[PDB]
């Protein structure tokens, strides 16, 4: 019988999703392991949820739960858990990013190109709520900018909607960094929609670094990581919890990664 | 012990070929939906890798699913073998034996997108395949649906080519590219499908070609990457809730007797929609 992992993501509409998942599934079907995928963002279900169906039919877990690390790596026993983007807590492994990293650069990217009106779009329903919108925030506040938050629905649709109605408010906005690549996507057709020429009227820049984002006109700037990267990181940890290499909980099983900044024709540099 | 989840659930296995052609990725979401909002369990095995088969994926589901919905890629008849009396529905290929099954008309989409490129009057159409020419002295249609477009621009005398290319979107705006070059009257292409279109988009953009005005652009699938592209691309589609519907109500009807494994009724035959965007006029 072979080793058998359960893969919990919180959809499969968020093509980040989709293509973090290939990448895991790969490397564990080369190992030889089985995966299975559960797409908890259904009916209410949680990532708590997703670990309760998975654990009877899997030797450990890698997942998106989104805070449930506590009580999952409970439900698992001495099965290991990999948790992503969330606090470790008593979770056995956890894999992290480097928001602080990823906001300098990005900002970096729109002081370069002289944007004087920027704004963030953060993914929720005043203040940023997330991680990565808070080291944005944490940046451009550091460095003075004058800047604007804009909350939207995660999806493309409700980016869109909601960019379309601060630009406006707000004519002059010519950089956008948006909480993720799919959200950008909707910016993009916002700004398209409104007249303005990108990145000449304004510049946009995502993160994730999906596939989707070459296929775009223009082509999307992104923070991006790479998948096999992340995909590696959390199959190698896994092996190592697995195997008693690593030992749960201990700092050798919290892995940080950085994205990295990839130019197309969205920004100019 | 009135406070617990209560009923032990039906267990349902999806099996797609892989996450990374955005259809799949939308389908399954579909299907996890229906069946969730039924009470079910789903466990999705994304067999694109490892040289594994659709064979393999049914082999690993079964003994922890009641049931199978999946494309399989021509292995419908044994992996319904597999699993016994364990319902299997299949999509999109010859169903053998399997419990239940969805195709879709091609000759009515084919006869659909045709209609939209004739009414816009485009003299120079090309049809772009998903598959390999490897083996042929020219390009040949290899697929149902790829077959259905050919033979409608055959029948209306149309002069038409055929391109053939991988089925990604980096593979279709190479091949496109290339023909583009030789054959630049080209005023209308239809896509294998919208990831293909994508990457049909991107040549044409590459080569100086407007979109709709020089060239339209048709796909299939009504994948929702089709409403982000510029220009938005207009394609020949199914609402996936209706696809995902018409597969979790078969399961349904197998699970419950009311309907008969391998019966007429357990086949079940969609229709796709013209969607139009940006990517056409008129
Ligand atoms: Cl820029
Ligand atoms: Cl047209
Ligand atoms: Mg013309």
């Given at each position: 019988?072979?080793?058998?992992?359960?893969?919990?993501?919180?959809?499969?509409?968020?093509?980040?999703?989709?293509?973090?998942?290939?990448?895991?599934?790969?490397?564990?079907?080369?190992?030889?392991?089985?995966?299975?995928?559960?797409?908890?963002?259904?009916?209410?279900?949680?990532?708590?949820?997703?670990?309760?169906?998975?654990?009877?039919?899997?030797?450990?877990?890698?997942?998106?739960?989104?805070?449930?690390?506590?009580?999952?790596?409970?439900?698992?026993?001495?099965?290991?858990?990999?948790?992503?983007?969330?606090?470790?807590?008593?979770?056995?492994?956890?894999?992290?990013?480097?928001?602080?990293?990823?906001?300098?650069?990005?900002?970096?990217?729109?002081?370069?190109?002289?944007?004087?009106?920027?704004?963030?779009?953060?993914?929720?329903?005043?203040?940023?709520?997330?991680?990565?919108?808070?080291?944005?925030?944490?940046?451009?506040?550091?460095?003075?900018?004058?800047?604007?938050?804009?909350?939207?629905?995660?999806?493309a649709?409700?980016?869109?909607?909601?960019?379309?109605?601060?630009?406006?408010?707000?004519?002059?906005?010519?950089?956008?960094?948006?909480?993720?690549d799919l959200?950008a996507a909707g910016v993009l057709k916002?700004l398209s929609?409104?007249?303005?020429?990108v990145?000449?009227?304004?510049?946009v820049?995502g993160?994730?670094?999906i596939p989707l984002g070459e296929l775009l006109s223009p082509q999307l700037s992104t923070?991006?990581?790479?998948?096999?990267?992340?995909?590696?990181?959390?199959?190698?940890?896994?092996?190592?919890?697995?195997?008693?290499?690593?030992?749960?909980?201990?700092?050798?099983?919290?892995?940080?990664?950085?994205?990295?900044?990839?130019?197309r024709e969205s920004?100019?540099?």
């Amino acid at each position: 019988a072979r080793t058998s992992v359960g893969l919990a993501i919180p959809d499969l509409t968020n093509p980040y999703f989709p293509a973090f998942a290939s990448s895991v599934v790969e490397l564990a079907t080369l190992r030889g392991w089985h995966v299975v995928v559960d797409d908890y963002g259904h009916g209410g279900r949680s990532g708590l949820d997703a670990v309760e169906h998975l654990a009877p039919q899997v030797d450990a877990v890698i997942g998106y739960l989104g805070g449930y690390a506590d009580q999952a790596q409970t439900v698992l026993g001495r099965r290991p858990l990999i948790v992503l983007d969330e606090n470790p807590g008593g979770a056995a492994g956890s894999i992290n990013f480097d928001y602080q990293h990823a906001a300098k650069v990005a900002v970096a990217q729109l002081m370069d190109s002289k944007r004087q009106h920027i704004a963030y779009l953060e993914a929720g329903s005043p203040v940023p709520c997330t991680v990565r919108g808070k080291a944005v925030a944490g940046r451009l506040d550091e460095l003075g900018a004058s800047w604007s938050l804009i909350v939207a629905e995660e999806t493309a649709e409700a980016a869109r909607e909601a960019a379309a109605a601060f630009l406006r408010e707000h004519p002059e906005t010519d950089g956008i960094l948006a909480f993720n690549d799919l959200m950008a996507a909707g910016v993009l057709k916002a700004l398209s929609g409104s007249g303005r020429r990108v990145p000449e009227d304004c510049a946009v820049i995502g993160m994730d670094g999906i596939p989707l984002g070459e296929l775009l006109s223009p082509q999307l700037s992104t923070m991006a990581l790479d998948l096999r990267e992340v995909g590696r990181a959390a199959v190698e940890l896994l092996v190592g919890l697995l195997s008693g290499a690593v030992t749960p909980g201990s700092q050798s099983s919290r892995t940080t990664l950085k994205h990295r900044l990839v130019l197309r024709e969205s920004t100019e540099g």
